[PDB]
C-alpha cells in the first residue's frame, strides 16, 4: 500500500524504524520543468532561424 | 502560469515567422509583459537582502 | 629623422585607433539616441493619447 | 578519340563563371564597398572572406587542367592599371582582354611565368592609390591556387612565393602600420598564409627563422589589438610548441595575459583545444574536462566531426583516468567510430580492471594509439588501472575483506591492502574513516549529496557564478541589439 | 508477403543459430518449401540447409513453374492492357507483385509496387501497398525503407481509421516499436486490442499477446498495470490460455520472487531464439531485474540480509556484487553502505533534488546559450 | 632523480616526452626512473625495499638512499595523516627500523599527543559552522552587484 | 583558418586505407542489428555485454542449481 | 593640419564624451516620465462605467457603438486593446464620462 502511495509512510527490516513525511511545494519543480522544457524548443527554434539565415 | 500561457504561443510563433516574416498583424508585443513579470519577480531578490539585515543586526 | 613618418606615425595610427574608440562612442550614442527617439516617439504617443 | 575529343571542352569552363564572379564581387565588392569609407566600415568582409576560403577548401577545380587549360596562370588583376583617372578604356580593355584570349586558341604554361609576378607591384600594383588592400587582396587570393600540389618540386617554387610575399609587403610591411580594415584582415591573412606553407617549414626544415622572428612582429602587432589576429599566430607558435618543445617555464603560466576577446568563433575550440592539449600532460581533471568538453560542444559550423575526432580521442583518454568513461552517446557519425574502434576494447576493459590479460590485450594489438609516441598515458595506465579499480573499491561497499576482495582485486595481501587504499584516501577525491579495532580497516564512504547539508554555502557560488553568467548574456543580448540599431 | 510463408521462413533464425531446433525448423520448411514459391527463399538459405543430393530435384521443376506462372502473368497484364479500366490493371500488376513476393524478389517487386504505387486512384489502396510493403518488410528487416512509405502515407489521410486498415498500420507500429526499444510511446499502440484479430498474414493474436505482454509486463510500472491491463478485461479473459502469463503477472504485482526466479528460466530461454524479439534479450533482463529492485527498494528504506536472502531465494554473494554494478552502473538510488552488513539508503531524491532535476537543463540550456553567443557577429 | 627529489614530479611528468627518444630502451637504467617513479605513482613502498638490491653495482644506490632519505618524509608525512587515528601496530611495519628517530623528530616536528601506546588524532572535522551572517552580508552585496549590473546602463 | 583538417583527413584516408571496407561489413554484422536503435541505450546495453561476454553471460538458467547450493 | 588634427581632434572627444552621462540621464528619466504619462492614463479607466453594445466597425482602430438606450455612438477605441474585443457581436462597456471601453463581458 506505500508501493500504491494511499498514505506517507515506509516500513524497516533491520531497525523497523517507521518515518512518514510529506512534500508540500509540488507544483513549482513541476511548473519551472516545463518552462525549461517548452523554453528549450525556442532556443533550438531560434538557432534554426539563424543557422537557416546564416549558412 | 501567465508565462506558460504565452509560451504556448510562443510555440507557434516560429513558424509563422518561419514562414512570412514580413508585417506584424498581432498587437501583442509579449516581451514588455515579461518584462514586468520579471519586475514583479525582483522583489524576491531585493527583499532578500532586507531579510540578510534584519537576521544579521 | 624618421619620426614624424615613424613616432608621430605611430601616433597618427594610435590617433586612429582612439577614433575607432570615438566610432563605439558614436554609434552608442546613434543606436542610444534613436532608441531614445524611440521611447520619445512612444512616450509621445501616449502624450497625444 | 571521339569520346574525350567531342567531350572535352564542355567540363574546363564549370568553375569559370563562379570564380571570375566570385573575384569581382568579392574585390569590386569589398573595394568598391570600404572604398568611400574603409576605417569606418569594418569587419564586413572578414566573414565573407573566411567563408570563402572554407567554401573553396574541398575545391576540385584542378584535376586535368594541365593539358593546355592552365591559361588562368598568366591571367592577373589588370583593373584600371598604369593610371588612376580616365579608366574608360580601361572599362572596354576589361572586355578586350578577356576577349582575345577567346576567338581561336592561348598561348598558356605552367610552370614558365611564375618568377616575373612582381612586375606590376614595382610601379603600380591596381590603381597606386588603394595599393596595400588591392595589392593582398589582388595577391594573396590566387598564389595559393598556383602553390596548390605542395608535392612534386613546387617547395622551391614555395619559397620563391613566400620571398616575394614578404619582399613585396610583409618583410616588415608596405608601410609600418597600415592601421585600416587590410591590416585587421592582413593579421589572419599573413597568418592564414603561415598555416599554408607550414608544412613546408614542418616537411624537411624546422624553427630557426620565420616563426622566431613572429615574437618581433608578434610585438611590432601593437599592444592596442584586440588581440585576434595576433591570437591567431600565437596559435602557430603553439602549435610549433605542441609536438616537440617541451619548456614549461614561460608559456605555461607567463603566457597567460589580459585575454582580450579572441573568439573568431574556431579559435575557442581549436586554440582551447590546443591549451587542453598542452594542459593534458599534467593530468588535469577539473579544468580541461569540462573546457576541453565544452570545446569538443562548440565550433558547429563548417565540421564538427572530422576534426572533434582527435579531441574526442584526448578526451575520452583523460576521462578514463578518472574512473568514470563515457562513451559516445549523443554523437553519430561514421568517423568516431571508426576512429574508437581499436580503442573501444580497452576502453571498455578499464572499468573491469582486469591487469594480467588486458595488460597483454593492450600491446597484443596495439598499433596507433601506443605507436602515437613515447606512450605516456598509456604507461601511466598501465599502473592507473588498479587506482581506477580502487577507487570503484571506493564507489562500493565499505568494509573491506581479506580474501573475497583482496582475492577480487588480484592483490591478497594484509600489507599491501591498506597500504595502497591508503594512497587512494591520501589523494582527498573519497572520504573514508580509518579505524583500526580488531584488525580489519573500516570506511564511512559518506558520499550523500549536500541536500540538508549547509546548502547555502554548497550552491552558493552555483548561484553567483550561473547569475554572471547569465547576466553577461544579458550584457550580450544588450550590445548586439545597439550593433543593430547603431546604422539606422 | 501475407501468405504463411512469411512464418515458414521466418524461422530460418532458429533454423540457422542453435543445431537442436533445427530439425523441425527444416521438417516443415522443406514440407512446405512447395508451397507459395518457396524456391529462391530457401535456396538463398541453402548453406544453413542440407546437401545438394535432394535440392537439385525440385529447383527443375520450381524454375519453369515460375517462369510459366510468371508469363501467365504477364499475358494477362497485356491483355489487362491497351483497355479502358484502372483497378484492372491495378489487380494484374499488383498480382504480380505479389507473386514477385512469393518468390521472394523484390527488384521486379519494387518496381512493380512502384508501378501499381504510381497507379493509385486512392489513398486508401495506396496504404494497402504501403502495408504489401511492410509485410516483406518484415522478412526483409529493412529500417529505413518501411518508414519511408509510412512516413509519407502517414499524413494526409482523412479518411478516418478503419476497422482493420488502421488497426493493422497499429500492428505494425507494434512491430517496429518492438524492433527498436522505444517503450513509454509503445505502451499506448497495444490499447486497441479490443477491435484486434486474428490475423494470418501477420502475426496470430495469442503470438500479439504473447509480444506485447513483455513491454506491457517491463515497461509499465505498477500504476500503469493497474489502470491498463489490470482494468482491462482483455488479460483477463487472455489469461486462461496460458498458466505461465497469470504466473508471471500475480508474482511480480504481488512481489513473490522465490516462484518468479524458480520460473524465469521459462522467460529466459522463451525469450531468445525469436525472429524480432532475440537480440533484445539482454535489454529486457537487466531492465526488469533493475526495474523489480527498485520495486522492492522503492517502498523499503533499510534492508537486512536475512529477509533479503529468504525473499529472493539467492545467496547473499551474488546479490554483493549485484547493488555493487547497480550503485554506479544501474544508478537507482543513493551510496549503500555495509558497516553493519545491512542494506540502508537514504535516497533524498525528492526535497532538494525534486528541485536539481532542472540543472542539466540549465547547464545545457547555459552551453546552448554560450552558443547564442557564438552566433553573434558571425 | 634531482626532480624527483625536490618535489617538482610534475615536471617529470611533463618530462616524460623528450626520454623516449628510442636510443637504448634495453639497459636497466633507462628504465629505472620510469618504473621508480611509476610506483611513487602507486605508492608502494615495500617494492623499492625489495628491490633495493635490484640495482647492479652501478655507484648511485647511495643517491637512491638519499632519495629515499628526501621522500621518507612525504611517505611518513602521507601514512600519518591520520583521519580518524591509526594504532601503533601498522606503523611498526609501515614505518622504518626500530631507531626512535622518527618518534623523536616527528614528537617536535608534528607535536601531537603520544598515548599508550597508541597515536591519537586531534582537531579532525572539529570546525564549527558559520553564523550564517557573514554570508548574508555578502549576499546582500551581491544583490547591490546585481541592481548594479541588471540596471546600469537603465 | 579549417586548413589544418587536410592532413586530419589524410590520416583517415591511411585509417580507410588499411582495411578495405572489412570493419564496414564486419561491424555491420552488429550494425544491422543495431541501426535504428537509440545508441544512448546501447552504451549500457554494450557495456554490460562486453561485460558479460567473458563469463556469465545469461547466469539466469545457473540460479535454479544455485538455489539449492547457496 | 597634419599634426593639428591631434590636438583639434580631441576637442571633437570631449564634444563626443559628454554626450554619455546626457544620453544616460535622457534614458533613465524619459522611461520615468513613461511610467508616470503609463500610470497617469491607466488610472483613467475606472471601474464604474456604463455597458453598451458594439455594431459595426468601419475600419482600423475606430468603430461604432450602440449605446443602451439605442442611439449609436461614434467613438475611437483604445490602442492598448487588440482586434480581439472587435467582435461586431459582443459585450462592449465604455466609460461613463470617457466612453472608452477597457475589456468586453462574456
Given at each position: 500500500?506505500?508501493?500504491?502511495?494511499?498514505?506517507?509512510?515506509?516500513?524497516d527490516?533491520?531497525?523497523?524504524?517507521?518515518?512518514?513525511?510529506?512534500?508540500?511545494?509540488?507544483?513549482?519543480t513541476?511548473?519551472?520543468a516545463?518552462?525549461?522544457?517548452?523554453?528549450?524548443?525556442?532556443?533550438?527554434?531560434?538557432?534554426?532561424?539563424?543557422?537557416?539565415?546564416?549558412? | 502560469?501567465?508565462?506558460?500561457?504565452v509560451?504556448?504561443?510562443?510555440?507557434?510563433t516560429?513558424?509563422?515567422?518561419?514562414?512570412?516574416n514580413?508585417?506584424?498583424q498581432?498587437?501583442?508585443?509579449?516581451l514588455?509583459?515579461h518584462?514586468?513579470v520579471?519586475?514583479?519577480?525582483?522583489?524576491?531578490?531585493?527583499?532578500?537582502?532586507?531579510?540578510?539585515?534584519?537576521?544579521?543586526? | 629623422?624618421?619620426e614624424?613618418?615613424?613616432?608621430?606615425?605611430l601616433?597618427?595610427?594610435?590617433?586612429?585607433?582612439?577614433?575607432?574608440?570615438?566610432?563605439?562612442?558614436?554609434d552608442?550614442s546613434q543606436?542610444?539616441?534613436?532608441?531614445?527617439?524611440?521611447?520619445?516617439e512612444?512616450?509621445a504617443?501616449?502624450?497625444?493619447? | 578519340?571521339?569520346g574525350?575529343?567531342?567531350?572535352?571542352p564542355?567540363?574546363?569552363?564549370?568553375?569559370?563563371?563562379?570564380?571570375?564572379?566570385?573575384?569581382?564581387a568579392?574585390?569590386?565588392?569589398?573595394?568598391?564597398?570600404?572604398?568611400g569609407?574603409?576605417a569606418?566600415?569594418?569587419?564586413?568582409h572578414?566573414?565573407?572572406?573566411?567563408?570563402?576560403?572554407?567554401?573553396?577548401?574541398?575545391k576540385?577545380?584542378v584535376?586535368?587542367?594541365?593539358?593546355?587549360v592552365?591559361?588562368k596562370?598568366?591571367?592577373?588583376?589588370?583593373?584600371?592599371?598604369?593610371?588612376?583617372?580616365?579608366?574608360?578604356?580601361?572599362?572596354?580593355?576589361?572586355?578586350?582582354?578577356?576577349?582575345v584570349?577567346?576567338?581561336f586558341t592561348?598561348?598558356?604554361?605552367?610552370?614558365?611565368?611564375l618568377?616575373?609576378?612582381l612586375?606590376?607591384?614595382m610601379?603600380?600594383?591596381?590603381?597606386?592609390?588603394?595599393?596595400?588592400?588591392?595589392?593582398?587582396?589582388?595577391?594573396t587570393p590566387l598564389?595559393?591556387?598556383?602553390?596548390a600540389?605542395?608535392?612534386?618540386?613546387?617547395?622551391?617554387?614555395?619559397?620563391?612565393?613566400?620571398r616575394?610575399?614578404?619582399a613585396q609587403?610583409?618583410?616588415?610591411?608596405?608601410?609600418?602600420k597600415?592601421?585600416?580594415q587590410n591590416?585587421?584582415?592582413?593579421?589572419?591573412?599573413?597568418?592564414?598564409?603561415?598555416?599554408?606553407?607550414?608544412?613546408?617549414?614542418?616537411?624537411?626544415?624546422?624553427?630557426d627563422?620565420?616563426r622566431?622572428?613572429?615574437?618581433a612582429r608578434?610585438?611590432?602587432?601593437?599592444?592596442?589589438?584586440?588581440?585576434?589576429?595576433?591570437?591567431?599566430?600565437?596559435?602557430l607558435?603553439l602549435?610549433?610548441?605542441?609536438?616537440?618543445?617541451?619548456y614549461?617555464?614561460?608559456?605555461?603560466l607567463?603566457?597567460?595575459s589580459?585575454?582580450?576577446?579572441?573568439?573568431?568563433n574556431?579559435?575557442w575550440?581549436?586554440?582551447?583545444y590546443?591549451?587542453?592539449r598542452?594542459?593534458?600532460?599534467?593530468?588535469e581533471?577539473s579544468?580541461?574536462?569540462?573546457t576541453?568538453?565544452?570545446?569538443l560542444?562548440?565550433?558547429?559550423?563548417?565540421?564538427?566531426?572530422?576534426?572533434?575526432?582527435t579531441?574526442h580521442?584526448?578526451l575520452?583518454?583523460?576521462?578514463?583516468?578518472?574512473?568514470e568513461?563515457?562513451d559516445?552517446?549523443?554523437?553519430?557519425?561514421?568517423?568516431?567510430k571508426?576512429s574508437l574502434?581499436?580503442?573501444?576494447?580497452?576502453?571498455?576493459?578499464?572499468?573491469?580492471?582486469?591487469?594480467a590479460?588486458?595488460?597483454q590485450?593492450?600491446?597484443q594489438?596495439?598499433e596507433?594509439?601506443?605507436?602515437d609516441?613515447?606512450y605516456?598515458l598509456?604507461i601511466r595506465?598501465?599502473?592507473?588501472?588498479?587506482?581506477?579499480?580502487?577507487?570503484?573499491?571506493?564507489?562500493?561497499?565499505?568494509?573491506?575483506?581479506?580474501?573475497?576482495?583482496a582475492?577480487?582485486?588480484?592483490?591478497?595481501?594484509?600489507?599491501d591492502?591498506?597500504?595502497?587504499?591508503?594512497?587512494?584516501?591520501?589523494?582527498?577525491?573519497?572520504?573514508?574513516?580509518?579505524?583500526?579495532?580488531?584488525?580489519?580497516?573500516?570506511?564511512k564512504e559518506?558520499i550523500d549529496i549536500y541536500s540538508?547539508?549547509?546548502?547555502?554555502?554548497?550552491?552558493?557560488?552555483?548561484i553567483?557564478?550561473?547569475?554572471?553568467?547569465?547576466?553577461?548574456?544579458?550584457?550580450?543580448?544588450?550590445?548586439?541589439?545597439?550593433s543593430?540599431?547603431?546604422?539606422? | 508477403?501475407?501468405?504463411?510463408?512469411?512464418?515458414?521462413?521466418?524461422?530460418?533464425?532458429?533454423?540457422?543459430?542453435?543445431?537442436?531446433?533445427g530439425?523441425?525448423?527444416?521438417?516443415?520448411?522443406?514440407?512446405?518449401?512447395?508451397?507459395?514459391?518457396?524456391?529462391?527463399?530457401?535456396?538463398?538459405?541453402?548453406?544453413?540447409?542440407?546437401?545438394?543430393?535432394?535440392?537439385?530435384?525440385?529447383?527443375?521443376?520450381?524454375?519453369?513453374?515460375?517462369?510459366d506462372e510468371?508469363?501467365?502473368?504477364?499475358?494477362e497484364?497485356?491483355?489487362?492492357?491497351?483497355?479502358?479500366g484502372?483497378?484492372?490493371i491495378?489487380?494484374?500488376?499488383?498480382?504480380?507483385?505479389?507473386?514477385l513476393?512469393?518468390?521472394?524478389d523484390?527488384?521486379?517487386?519494387?518496381?512493380?509496387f512502384?508501378?501499381?504505387?504510381?497507379?493509385?486512384?486512392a489513398?486508401?489502396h495506396?496504404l494497402?501497398?504501403?502495408?504489401?510493403?511492410?509485410?516483406?518488410?518484415?522478412?526483409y528487416?529493412?529500417?529505413?525503407?518501411?518508414?519511408?512509405?509510412?512516413?509519407?502515407?502517414?499524413?494526409?489521410?482523412?479518411?478516418?481509421?478503419?476497422?482493420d486498415?488502421?488497426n493493422?498500420?497499429?500492428?505494425?507500429?507494434?512491430?517496429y516499436?518492438?524492433?527498436?526499444?522505444?517503450?513509454?510511446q509503445?505502451?499506448?499502440?497495444?490499447?486497441?486490442?479490443?477491435?484486434?484479430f486474428?490475423?494470418?498474414?501477420?502475426?496470430?493474436?495469442?503470438?500479439?499477446?504473447?509480444?506485447?505482454?513483455?513491454?506491457?509486463?517491463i515497461?509499465?510500472?505498477?500504476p500503469?498495470?493497474?489502470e491498463?491491463?489490470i482494468?482491462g478485461?482483455e488479460?483477463?479473459?487472455?489469461?486462461?490460455?496460458?498458466?505461465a502469463?497469470r504466473?508471471?503477472?500475480?508474482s511480480?504485482?504481488?512481489c513473490?520472487?522465490?516462484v518468479?526466479?524458480?520460473?524465469?528460466?521459462?522467460v529466459?530461454?522463451?525469450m531468445?531464439?525469436?525472429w524480432?524479439?532475440?537480440p533484445?534479450?539482454?535489454?529486457?533482463?537487466?531492465?526488469?531485474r533493475?526495474?523489480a529492485?527498485s520495486?522492492?527498494?522503492?517502498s523499503?528504506?533499510?534492508?537486512?540480509?536475512?529477509?533479503?536472502?529468504?525473499?529472493?531465494?539467492?545467496?547473499?554473494?551474488?546479490?554483493?556484487?549485484?547493488?555493487?554494478?547497480?550503485?554506479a552502473?544501474?544508478?537507482?538510488?543513493?551510496?549503500?553502505?555495509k558497516?553493519?552488513?545491512?542494506?540502508?539508503?537514504?535516497?533524498?531524491?525528492?526535497k532538494?533534488?525534486?528541485?536539481?532535476?532542472?540543472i542539466?537543463?540549465?547547464?545545457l540550456?547555459l552551453?546552448?546559450v554560450?552558443?547564442?553567443?557564438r552566433?553573434?557577429?558571425? | 632523480?634531482?626532480l624527483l627529489?625536490?618535489?617538482?614530479?610534475?615536471?617529470?611528468?611533463?618530462e616524460?616526452?623528450?626520454?623516449?627518444?628510442?636510443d637504448?630502451?634495453?639497459?636497466?637504467?633507462?628504465?629505472?626512473?620510469?618504473?621508480?617513479?611509476?610506483?611513487?605513482?602507486?605508492?608502494?613502498?615495500?617494492?623499492?625495499?625489495?628491490?633495493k638490491?635490484?640495482?647492479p653495482?652501478?655507484?648511485?644506490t647511495?643517491?637512491?638512499?638519499?632519495?629515499?632519505?628526501?621522500?621518507?618524509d612525504?611517505?611518513?608525512?602521507?601514512?600519518?595523516?591520520?583521519?580518524?587515528?591509526?594504532?601503533?601496530?601498522e606503523?611498526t611495519?609501515?614505518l622504518f627500523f626500530?631507531?626512535?628517530?622518527?618518534?623523536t623528530d616527528?614528537?617536535?616536528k608534528?607535536?601531537?599527543?603520544l598515548?599508550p601506546?597508541?597515536?591519537?588524532?586531534?582537531?579532525?572535522?572539529q570546525?564549527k559552522?558559520?553564523?550564517?551572517?557573514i554570508p548574508?552580508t555578502?549576499?546582500?552585496?551581491?544583490?547591490?552587484?546585481?541592481?548594479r549590473?541588471?540596471?546600469?546602463?537603465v | 583558418?579549417?586548413?589544418?583538417?587536410?592532413?586530419?583527413?589524410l590520416?583517415l584516408?591511411?585509417?580507410?586505407?588499411?582495411?578495405?571496407?572489412?570493419?564496414?561489413?564486419?561491424?555491420?554484422?552488429?550494425?544491422?542489428?543495431?541501426?535504428?536503435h537509440?545508441?544512448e541505450?546501447?552504451?549500457?546495453?554494450?557495456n554490460?555485454?562486453?561485460?558479460?561476454?567473458n563469463?556469465?553471460?545469461?547466469?539466469?538458467?545457473?540460479?535454479?542449481?544455485?538455489?539449492?547450493?547457496? | 593640419?597634419?599634426?593639428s588634427?591631434y590636438?583639434?581632434l580631441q576637442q571633437?572627444?570631449?564634444?563626443?564624451?559628454v554626450?554619455?552621462?546626457?544620453?544616460?540621464?535622457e534614458?533613465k528619466?524619459?522611461?520615468?516620465?513613461?511610467?508616470?504619462?503609463?500610470?497617469?492614463?491607466?488610472?483613467?479607466?475606472?471601474?464604474?462605467?456604463?455597458?453598451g453594445?458594439?455594431?459595426?466597425?468601419?475600419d482600423?482602430?475606430?468603430a461604432?457603438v450602440?449605446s443602451?438606450?439605442?442611439?449609436?455612438?461614434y467613438?475611437?477605441?483604445?490602442?492598448?486593446?487588440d482586434?480581439?474585443?472587435?467582435?461586431?457581436?459582443?459585450?462592449?462597456?465604455?466609460?461613463?464620462?470617457?466612453?472608452?471601453?477597457?475589456?468586453?463581458?462574456?
Open positions: 500500500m506505500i508501493l500504491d502511495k494511499k498514505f506517507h509512510g515506509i516500513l527490516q533491520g531497525e523497523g524504524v517507521l518515518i512518514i513525511f510529506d512534500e508540500p511545494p509540488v507544483d513549482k513541476y511548473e519551472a516545463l518552462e525549461t522544457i517548452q523554453n528549450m524548443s525556442k532556443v533550438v527554434d531560434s538557432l534554426y532561424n539563424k543557422a537557416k539565415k546564416l549558412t | 502560469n501567465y508565462n506558460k500561457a509560451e504556448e504561443e510562443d510555440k507557434m516560429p513558424e509563422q515567422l518561419a514562414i512570412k514580413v508585417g506584424k498581432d498587437p501583442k508585443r509579449h514588455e509583459e518584462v514586468d520579471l519586475m514583479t519577480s525582483n522583489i524576491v531578490q531585493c527583499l532578500a537582502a532586507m531579510l540578510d539585515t534584519v537576521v544579521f543586526k | 629623422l624618421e614624424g613618418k615613424a613616432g608621430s606615425g601616433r597618427q595610427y594610435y590617433l586612429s585607433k582612439i577614433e575607432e574608440l570615438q566610432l563605439i562612442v558614436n552608442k543606436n542610444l539616441r534613436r532608441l531614445q527617439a524611440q521611447r520619445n512612444l512616450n504617443k501616449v502624450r497625444l493619447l | 578519340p571521339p574525350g575529343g567531342e567531350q572535352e564542355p567540363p574546363p569552363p564549370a568553375p569559370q563563371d563562379v570564380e571570375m564572379k566570385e573575384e569581382a568579392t574585390g569590386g565588392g569589398s573595394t568598391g564597398e570600404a572604398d569609407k574603409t569606418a566600415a569594418a569587419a564586413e572578414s566573414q565573407r572572406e573566411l567563408d570563402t576560403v572554407t567554401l573553396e577548401d574541398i576540385e577545380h584535376k586535368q587542367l594541365e593539358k593546355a592552365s591559361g596562370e598568366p591571367r592577373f588583376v589588370l583593373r584600371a592599371l598604369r593610371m588612376l583617372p580616365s579608366t574608360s578604356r580601361r572599362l572596354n580593355h576589361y572586355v578586350l582582354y578577356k576577349a584570349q577567346g576567338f592561348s598561348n598558356n604554361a605552367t610552370r614558365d611565368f618568377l616575373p609576378f612586375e606590376e607591384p610601379d603600380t600594383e591596381a590603381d597606386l592609390q588603394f595599393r596595400p588592400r588591392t595589392g593582398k587582396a589582388a595577391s598564389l595559393p591556387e598556383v602553390e600540389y605542395l608535392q612534386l618540386l613546387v617547395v622551391i617554387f614555395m619559397m620563391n612565393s613566400k616575394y610575399k614578404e609587403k610583409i618583410s616588415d610591411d608596405l608601410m609600418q597600415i592601421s585600416t591590416r585587421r584582415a592582413l593579421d589572419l591573412v599573413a597568418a592564414k598564409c603561415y598555416y599554408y606553407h607550414a608544412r613546408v617549414y614542418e616537411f624537411l626544415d624546422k624553427l627563422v620565420v622566431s622572428f613572429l615574437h608578434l610585438r611590432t602587432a601593437t599592444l592596442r589589438h584586440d588581440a585576434d589576429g595576433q591570437a591567431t599566430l600565437l596559435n607558435l602549435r610549433n610548441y605542441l609536438h616537440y618543445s617541451l614549461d617555464q614561460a608559456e605555461k607567463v603566457s597567460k589580459v585575454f582580450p576577446e579572441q573568439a573568431n574556431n579559435e575550440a581549436r586554440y582551447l590546443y591549451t587542453g598542452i594542459k593534458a600532460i599534467q593530468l581533471y579544468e580541461a574536462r569540462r576541453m568538453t565544452n570545446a560542444r562548440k565550433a558547429p559550423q563548417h565540421t564538427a566531426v572530422g576534426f572533434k575526432q579531441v580521442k584526448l575520452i583518454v583523460v576521462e578514463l583516468l578518472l574512473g568513461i563515457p559516445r552517446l549523443q554523437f553519430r557519425q561514421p568517423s568516431l571508426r574502434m581499436p580503442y573501444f576494447l580497452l576502453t571498455q576493459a578499464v572499468r573491469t580492471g582486469n591487469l590479460k588486458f595488460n590485450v593492450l600491446d594489438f596495439g596507433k594509439f601506443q605507436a609516441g613515447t605516456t598509456i595506465l598501465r599502473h592507473n588501472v588498479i587506482k581506477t579499480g580502487v577507487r570503484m573499491i571506493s564507489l562500493s561497499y565499505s568494509r573491506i575483506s581479506l580474501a573475497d576482495i582475492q577480487k582485486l588480484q592483490l591478497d595481501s594484509p600489507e591492502a591498506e597500504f595502497i587504499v591508503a594512497k587512494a584516501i591520501r589523494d582527498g577525491v573519497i572520504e573514508a574513516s580509518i579505524n583500526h579495532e580488531k584488525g580489519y580497516v573500516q570506511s559518506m540538508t547539508r549547509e546548502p547555502q554555502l554548497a550552491f552558493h557560488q552555483r553567483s557564478f550561473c547569475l554572471d553568467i547569465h547576466n553577461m548574456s544579458v550584457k550580450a543580448m544588450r550590445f548586439p541589439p545597439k543593430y540599431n547603431k546604422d539606422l | 508477403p501475407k501468405n504463411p510463408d512469411l512464418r515458414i521462413a521466418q524461422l530460418r533464425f532458429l533454423l540457422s543459430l542453435p543445431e537442436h531446433r530439425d523441425a525448423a527444416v521438417r516443415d520448411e522443406l514440407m512446405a518449401a512447395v508451397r507459395d514459391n518457396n524456391m529462391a527463399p530457401y535456396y538463398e538459405a541453402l548453406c544453413k540447409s542440407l546437401d545438394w543430393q535432394i535440392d537439385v530435384d525440385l529447383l527443375n521443376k520450381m524454375k519453369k513453374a515460375n517462369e510468371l508469363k501467365r502473368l504477364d499475358e497484364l497485356e491483355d489487362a492492357e491497351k483497355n479502358l484502372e483497378s484492372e491495378r489487380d494484374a500488376m499488383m498480382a504480380k507483385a505479389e507473386y513476393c512469393r518468390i521472394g523484390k527488384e521486379g517487386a519494387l518496381t512493380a512502384r508501378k501499381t504505387y504510381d497507379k493509385t486512384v489513398l486508401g495506396r494497402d501497398i504501403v502495408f504489401y510493403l511492410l509485410r516483406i518488410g518484415l522478412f528487416m529493412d529500417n529505413d525503407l518501411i518508414t519511408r512509405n509510412t512516413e509519407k502515407a502517414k499524413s494526409l489521410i482523412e479518411e478516418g481509421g478503419d476497422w486498415r488502421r493493422r498500420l497499429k500492428v505494425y507500429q507494434g512491430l516499436c518492438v524492433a527498436i526499444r522505444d517503450f513509454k509503445a505502451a499506448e499502440l497495444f490499447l486497441d486490442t479490443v477491435s484486434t486474428t490475423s494470418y498474414e501477420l502475426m496470430d493474436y495469442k503470438t500479439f499477446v504473447t509480444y506485447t505482454v513483455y513491454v506491457s509486463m515497461a509499465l510500472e505498477r500503469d498495470l493497474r491498463k491491463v482494468k478485461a488479460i483477463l479473459e487472455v489469461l486462461h490460455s496460458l498458466p502469463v504466473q508471471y503477472l500475480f511480480l504485482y504481488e513473490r520472487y522465490s518468479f526466479f524458480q520460473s524465469l528460466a521459462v529466459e530461454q522463451e531468445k531464439k525469436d524480432l524479439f532475440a533484445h534479450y539482454r535489454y529486457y533482463v537487466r531492465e526488469m533493475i526495474h529492485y520495486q522492492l527498494l522503492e523499503y528504506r533499510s534492508l537486512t540480509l536475512g529477509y533479503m536472502a529468504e525473499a529472493f531465494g539467492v545467496g547473499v554473494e551474488f546479490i554483493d556484487q549485484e547493488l555493487s554494478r547497480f550503485i552502473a544501474g544508478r537507482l538510488h543513493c551510496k549503500i553502505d558497516v553493519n552488513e545491512i542494506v540502508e539508503t537514504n535516497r533524498p531524491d525528492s532538494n533534488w525534486q528541485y536539481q532535476e532542472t542539466k537543463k540549465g547547464d540550456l552551453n546552448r554560450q552558443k547564442l553567443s552566433v553573434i557577429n558571425m | 632523480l634531482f627529489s625536490q618535489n617538482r614530479v610534475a615536471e617529470f611528468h611533463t616524460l616526452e623528450r626520454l623516449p627518444a628510442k637504448i630502451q634495453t639497459n636497466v637504467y633507462i628504465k629505472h626512473p620510469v618504473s621508480l617513479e611509476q610506483y611513487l605513482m602507486e605508492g608502494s613502498y615495500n617494492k623499492v625495499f625489495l628491490a638490491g635490484n640495482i653495482a652501478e655507484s648511485y647511495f643517491f637512491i638512499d638519499i632519495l629515499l632519505d628526501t621522500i621518507r612525504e611517505i611518513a608525512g602521507c601514512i600519518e595523516k591520520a583521519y580518524e587515528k591509526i594504532l601503533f601496530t606503523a611495519r609501515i626500530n631507531t626512535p628517530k622518527k618518534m616527528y614528537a617536535k608534528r607535536g601531537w599527543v598515548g601506546n597508541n597515536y591519537y588524532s586531534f582537531a579532525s572535522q570546525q559552522p558559520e553564523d550564517t551572517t548574508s555578502e549576499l546582500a552585496k551581491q544583490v547591490i552587484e546585481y541592481a549590473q541588471l540596471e546600469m546602463i | 583558418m579549417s586548413e589544418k583538417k587536410q592532413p586530419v583527413d590520416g584516408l591511411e585509417e580507410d586505407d588499411e582495411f578495405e571496407e572489412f570493419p564496414a561489413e564486419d561491424w555491420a554484422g552488429l550494425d544491422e542489428d543495431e541501426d535504428a537509440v545508441w541505450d546501447n552504451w549500457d546495453d554494450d554490460v555485454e562486453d561485460d558479460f561476454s563469463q556469465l553471460r545469461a547466469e539466469l538458467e545457473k540460479h535454479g542449481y544455485k538455489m539449492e547450493t547457496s | 593640419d597634419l599634426y588634427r590636438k583639434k571633437e572627444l570631449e564634444f563626443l564624451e554626450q554619455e552621462e546626457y544620453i544616460k540621464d534614458q528619466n524619459l522611461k520615468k516620465e513613461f511610467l508616470h504619462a503609463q500610470e497617469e492614463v491607466k488610472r483613467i479607466q475606472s471601474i464604474p462605467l456604463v455597458i453594445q458594439f455594431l459595426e466597425a468601419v482600423q482602430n475606430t461604432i450602440g443602451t438606450t439605442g442611439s449609436n455612438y467613438v475611437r477605441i483604445l490602442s492598448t486593446i482586434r480581439e474585443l472587435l467582435k461586431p457581436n459582443a459585450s462592449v462597456a465604455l466609460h461613463k464620462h470617457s466612453n472608452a471601453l477597457v475589456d468586453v463581458l462574456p
